[PDB]
Amino acid sequence: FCGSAMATGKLLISYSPPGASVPTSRKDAMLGTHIVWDIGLQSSCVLCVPWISQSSAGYITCWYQTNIVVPPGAPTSCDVLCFASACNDFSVRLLRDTPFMA
Amino acid sequence: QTRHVVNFHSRSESTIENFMGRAACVFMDQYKINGEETSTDRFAVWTINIREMAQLRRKCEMFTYMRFDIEMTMVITSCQMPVLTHQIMYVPPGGPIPAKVDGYEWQTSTNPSVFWTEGNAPPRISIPFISVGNAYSSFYDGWSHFTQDGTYGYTTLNAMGKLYIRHVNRSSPHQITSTIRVYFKPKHIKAWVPRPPRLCPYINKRDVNFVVTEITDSRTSITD
Amino acid sequence: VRSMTLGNSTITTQNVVVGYGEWPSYLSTAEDQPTQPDVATCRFYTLESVQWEKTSPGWWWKFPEALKNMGLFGQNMHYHYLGRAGYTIHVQCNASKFHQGCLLVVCVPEAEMGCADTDTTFPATELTTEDTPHVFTSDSITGKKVQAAVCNAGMGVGVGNLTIFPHQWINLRTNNSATIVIPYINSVPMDNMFRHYNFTLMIIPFAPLNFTDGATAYVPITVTIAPMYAEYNGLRLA
Amino acid sequence: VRSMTLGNSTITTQNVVVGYGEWPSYLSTAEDQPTQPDVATCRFYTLESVQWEKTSPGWWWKFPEALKNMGLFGQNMHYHYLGRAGYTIHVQCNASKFHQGCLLVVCVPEAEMGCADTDTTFPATELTTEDTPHVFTSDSITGKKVQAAVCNAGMGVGVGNLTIFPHQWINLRTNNSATIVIPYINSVPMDNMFRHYNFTLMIIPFAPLNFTDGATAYVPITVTIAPMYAEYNGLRLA
Amino acid sequence: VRSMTLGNSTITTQNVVVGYGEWPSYLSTAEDQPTQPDVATCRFYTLESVQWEKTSPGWWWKFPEALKNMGLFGQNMHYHYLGRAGYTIHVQCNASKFHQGCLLVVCVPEAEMGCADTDTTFPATELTTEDTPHVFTSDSITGKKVQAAVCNAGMGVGVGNLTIFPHQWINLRTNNSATIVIPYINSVPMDNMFRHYNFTLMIIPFAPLNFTDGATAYVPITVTIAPMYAEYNGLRLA
């Protein structure tokens, strides 16, 4: 969370399994897998998404649990950066040519 | 296709030697046998560098520094006679080059060359780590000539040599047009200083110049 | 900062008021045998966040049936007609440093509330709207509904001395979070979860919210309930 | 708060990202003998502070020759034609508590940058202006200079995955200071300090600066470099 | 007479053919983690009884998805997209003492069946009608459906030498009950339960039913499946 040091709110980060459908509402995301990430306490919440392979995948949605509460001095609109890597160890087998290069 | 349980645990195919050490064709060229006694179309050149084709060039730019033996195997054909014998002369970085098919450089004892006659297995010539430094540099943020002169980005440490190829047959009754395919392969390869992958397409084979490309493919909204 | 997790629900927290000095527990017969779900049920059910403005008089939720549409706990209410639970209730406020105010977070077992115009009753959809809270009012109201005026919260008592119950103050000067554990207060070991409202979580702002013309015009109050030690009747034969 | 001192230069600091897990060290022959200055050279060379506004796209410095006019280190570059060093780089931001933003402080060894309009080169004064930084741009540019558009920082790579190098995030919510130690990455043990730029300290704002109409319209970023374990060639006979 | 019970399902039974000499078992990684339901799932799912007349040619069920509407096992198929199970299959016949006949109760893993008029396919609702069985036919048939003629059961093999699979004869002279345990034969440890039919329980009368003009004109065949050691993928984070 790259907002102010005075901005405070909650975000609800839901994960859908690879077969399931996306939550259409915040309550339906709360009934599945989620983490109510309090911004005012910690500013960096870490996941670890399993069952990621190919040879119809999951979803990382994010919801307003609460709005961003801000004092009169700090700005109202903030940003959230995301990151991604291999969680513990990663398995990979069959080498090929990349599609990007032409 | 369908999403299967891809259950196994292996990273032997992700090591550097199992990622870079793969033979790829890097040089097609034609060269005749007769006519035009002073011509440049009777032999091949190919200054050896990793910046030959963009598929391999992209893999060498994962890493800043790397050192490796190279083991190339040529695949020589012919069109249109006797049985033909070829010559693949590798000159080192410090080495004289021929100007014509009948130059005296071809007889230099310090330029190793294979004499492959047609019909046998393809000729294989292996070249060790030549460079003056301790590794080949994929990128060189620097100037060849001191005091910020011309020729940006080209160091002389990552010079690998050249590969002059000709027929040894002096003449022929008719025209024979041979085609050579050089199969470059890194060997015993080490690599230092990883580096983010290339995003933009390549422009030229001696520079890093590029057109500003978008990061990823766009989608409609942030939530779809 | 402690990141509690239960099942597949993780919240981020920042002292617990154990209600009546007791921690919820199981009931421990072959004539009547309880079923202990344990699986799921115990996860955190975060309700919808509630905006607290300068003119908000209060809120109340009536449990156990406030969770009647909340997942497996709200689905085991329809298959078993007897049950009991513990309901750890976290109440954050995540206001700023320039906001001021104070809340009474109290649980009030057996809050029998009174109708707005007496000599009649209310249509039973005025006590509870499952997930969403019924607000109080600042003055008296009429009509076939709950007399929801503060100073006489629901029961005809003084709202100031509502502190006799398991409570916690949320003074935005000092703290923001409250947590209450309510170990199933009832006169029968198991009761139906749709007829009987075991307790009434009501959040009442004593000192009103105040701020200046630059801050956000509200403070969202987040309510999270974890049904602990929920056990039900048996459905199998003996 | 730790008040580090080196020689006759003291700074005031507030965790170190050791680049590639190695601390700089000396090279350990009578055919070629290095000279270790130790004296001076190791002191802190604070560059000019850089104002970070809402519309700043980034900056870059090219070392070792960014210090080419900095004291004895910038004078030993003219007398010895071979050298190596370590360059502890502190990057403070000293913003307020109401400012928000985020920086990527990355070092990028061997940042070979690309010309703005390809098929030609740039006049060598576009990569570096010794002490002062070349800024990036928000969009594409033309002319005989460096293609300094972010999202393709200098090298034609994605600017988001520039985190593979020795980096440090400066999130003004949490921290303000960064420190990176870069143990002389090169393919030859010693190289000339005017031809070759060993690394490129580039500071890139991912989340832009934001504030309200009362704060200062900028945040000054302070860069401090300490050349560690600098050693040169020998000038004496053998 | 043994009265087996599993969960809340008790049947009354009267030797087990363990398929391929192996008893089903669990799969025993943090990159992919299975969930073992154990609770429910293992109970007996009695299908609808099937009347066996003198002119019945046979039946087949395609599992695992024959249980796609059977309780929690048929509901965990919709929430998890990977799974495996064991399927103890009891087949009673409860005929009289004056009825005669013989059945082949065989399981046939990977029964890829052929279309009735080749050069085309069938509309995927011809292989399975969840709970109810598709009957065979006594002669050849046409149309976009399964070639369900016995002597070429589904696969183009001889129906007599279908005994290579896990089988059991039900000779009404001697016995009436069959039980087969099929330990999840597949080439991948877990597979989707709607795409792939792991095996095909087909009951084929070799010797036809016969009786006189006083007995009941049919013999009801009762099929009961207990999914053993069912495990699924994980839905939680790691």
From TrEMBL, chain A:
It comes from the Viruses. Disulfide bonds join 48-87. This is Genome polyprotein. Transmembrane segments: none annotated. Capsid protein VP1: Interacts with capsid protein VP0, and capsid protein VP3 to form heterotrimeric protomers. Five protomers subsequently associate to form pentamers which serve as building blocks for the capsid. Interacts with capsid protein VP2, capsid protein VP3 and capsid protein VP4 following cleavage of capsid protein VP0. It is found in: Host cytoplasmic vesicle membrane; Host nucleus; Virion. The chain holds residues 450 to 562 of 2189 of the full protein. The lineage of its organism: Viruses, Riboviria, Orthornavirae, Pisuviricota, Pisoniviricetes. Protease 2A: Cysteine protease that cleaves viral polyprotein and specific host proteins. Belongs to the picornaviruses polyprotein family.
